Amino acid sequence: AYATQGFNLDDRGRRIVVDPVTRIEGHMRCEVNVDANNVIRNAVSTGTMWRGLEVILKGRDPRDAWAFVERICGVCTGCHALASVRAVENALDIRIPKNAHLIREIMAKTLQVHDHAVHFYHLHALDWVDVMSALKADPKRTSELQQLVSPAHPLSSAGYFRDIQNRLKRFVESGQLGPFMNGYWGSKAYVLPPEANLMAVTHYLEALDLQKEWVKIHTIFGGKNPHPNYLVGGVPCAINLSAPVNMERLSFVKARIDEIIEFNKNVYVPDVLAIGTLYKQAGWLYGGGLAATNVLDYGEYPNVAYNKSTDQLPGGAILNGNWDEVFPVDPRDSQQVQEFVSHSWYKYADESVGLHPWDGVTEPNYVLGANTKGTRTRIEQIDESAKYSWIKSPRWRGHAMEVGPLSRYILAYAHARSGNKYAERPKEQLEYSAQMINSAIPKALGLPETQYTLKQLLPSTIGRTLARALESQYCGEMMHSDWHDLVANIRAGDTATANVDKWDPATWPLQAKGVGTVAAPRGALGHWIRIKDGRIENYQCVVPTTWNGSPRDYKGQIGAFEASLMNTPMVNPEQPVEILRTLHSFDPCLACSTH
């Protein structure tokens, strides 16, 4: 046992293993120890995959890199491509034209909405929603709940909910439960009434049909989704009012954006507010982890291209829960972002040191500690005192940080309180949400009104889930504005989409280094490149789930996943309901984390 970051870690209790962790992207193993009362007192995050993209990129053409690193992940599809072209453009001093900037922003914000909404319904919801309980719901009371939760949503009739319930009934009655097979249904960890469960399952199905429409924005500008195409110097989708982009194509994009705004406002945000309220009422405010102290994001979405002071999700770092002081974060500073491998399956010359990604090294070293139960190819209990993950350990000035929508919303709130007007909308969303969760929704449902502050509500698994939903809504609103700016710019006579001045490597400096950062759906993404004689000399990625899912560092400090599980009671230690609920609130992408 040892103490770190205000957590008292203790591995003397009962050991529980969850492998595979499901309803995530990629491969993760989680182990915990629980005390005599089933409270988690130790948590261990193990990334169980590695592909070696950083190694594969060496020697290749910087202009091709985006396509390779895009394939780090098909869920957060395109965010790595964006980071890569930004990194290369930064290295080569390339400034992209306004239309390329706006199209990239629209694609980024489309990804945010798609990723967030699909995560919540198709990966996260089953941690809050009991599908079998939905079968016992009254269609009429479910209609009445829907009208209270979101009066503007037109799909609310008793008949509609009855037909959905009937389809669920016959599916279950077939004896082939598919994705619901061997579930934790009926656990006391589930608190929603039957009607809330049926509403949620109905929206699960609605979202599954709708999500395919949203990504058609990627298809127009990038050719396909998943894995739309990008370009160093701009975008390939040339404009002509026989061209990739004309007014009809832009009108199509606007129709999709308008649908997105309706979904976020009428289905997604209200569901999360309602579900959050009910779990708040149950007292389930666990999962804060590092969000209560240390959060980071690079900052994103400048109103004015290349002007970071205008970031609409302004970033930085907060330490020790002090929301009155946001420290600036510089991805170029060798003493800020560093990665350790002390407890990771890699090797450095000196593993007491953290490497900035321009100096990063990725040499695999799969080896298990002396206290392992099992063998090298048949692990029963992983040894977290030694190397236990394919995920590196990123830290900021040595501090362990949480990243993600919650981090961005805490940073936005802090910025807004200091007088940053670019963060006014996120502040508005947060204050609106707190009032709904504390007062409006309880009043509507005949529950007691509560008085939680944002400082109390946000650092929790509920808060982390809320921030994701609000961010989806904000991104939809922002790309609506971007669309108007794009069309206005084109109509004013600027049709440029690519700067080709430095396309040819004969124009390049003989060596260069660059960094590209992105507020990816799961948090702070950076790609760091060194170019030599037209080729990639070094390419290192530090990805949001690398931060959140990181194993312990040289000092033994825990990462966001491990911290978030601490001190959480489990109804039944052999049913990982609470473990999944909190882990899923980070939207873990394990392919991203390891690359």
């Binding site: 070696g52 394939r71 098909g74 082939q176 050719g223 040339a238 695999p364």
Partner: protein
């Protein structure tokens, strides 16, 4: 009864799973609820850990020789296979276990079919396509990074309707989707035939939709349904949106030179 599908995940980026749920005809919702029984899939399944593991043996026993194994991603042979760990063991062991009693095996995407990005030089994990590991079972390759959504659901629909693998070419790809090269029916073909090419991004030729051959388009050597079926309910495809085909459905496309270097001859 609906045919069980056990959808395994090796080393992957999950693009194939994502593409599958974009299908408009049929809807993925209808496939899952009314066509197959998707009994194991890490991406969507309710159960985790021991409860998820228990599903495999239950289905394999009850439906022996009568379930479909779908594989996304691939097994690594380096790091003693532990660069992809499932249930404390190498993925390759899970793959071989579930494969042994499958009626048919679908290799989804370029990862499962050929190796894709992780198998690009120098392949640090020795990522290996499914057919090089499983050599005694019928395998249909559905390559592409990812494949087109309707190609994926089209393969499933055929297999469920007919209880047969569709006719395959010599590389194991379904002829109903992979018989044409992109260049055969690419709408920019009249420009190619007339020697009308984009030569720099956003030049006048690019704004008129001229052929992308000189910008590196690998359509002339790539078999897929992209130029006709197109992407995301026929909305576009790479070439229509202005970027050359990078050859993503072809074996080893990452190591055929820069995507922006034109084909020779």
């Amino acid at each position: 009864p609906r045919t069980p599908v056990l959808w395994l995940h090796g080393l992957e980026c999950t693009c194939c799973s994502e593409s599958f749920i974009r299908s408009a005809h049929p809807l993925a919702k209808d496939v899952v609820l009314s066509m197959i029984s998707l009994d194991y899939d890490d991406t969507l399944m309710a159960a985790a850990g021991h409860q998820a593991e228990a599903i495999l043996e239950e289905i394999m026993t009850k439906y022996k020789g009568n379930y479909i194994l779908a594989v996304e991603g691939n097994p690594p042979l380096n790091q003693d296979g532990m660069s992809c760990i499932i249930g404390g063991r190498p993925f390759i062991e899970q793959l071989k276990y579930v494969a042994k009693d499958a009626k048919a095996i679908i290799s989804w995407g370029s990862c499962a079919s050929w190796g894709c990005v992780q198998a690009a030089k120098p392949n640090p994990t020795q990522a290996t396509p499914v057919h090089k590991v499983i050599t005694d079972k019928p395998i249909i390759k559905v390559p592409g990074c990812p494949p087109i959504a309707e190609v994926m659901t089209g393969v499933i629909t055929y297999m469920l309707t007919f209880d047969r693998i569709p006719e395959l070419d010599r590389q194991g790809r379904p002829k109903m989707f992979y018989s044409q090269r992109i260049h055969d029916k690419c709408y920019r073909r009249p420009h190619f035939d007339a020697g009308q090419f984009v030569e720099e991004w956003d030049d006048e030729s690019a704004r008129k939709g001229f052929c992308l051959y000189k910008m590196g388009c690998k359509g002339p050597t790539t078999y897929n349904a992209c130029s006709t079926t197109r992407w995301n309910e026929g909305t576009s495809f790479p070439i229509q949106s202005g970027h050359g085909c990078i050859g993503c459905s072809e074996d080893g496309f990452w190591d055929k030179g820069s995507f922006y270097d034109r084909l020779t001859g």
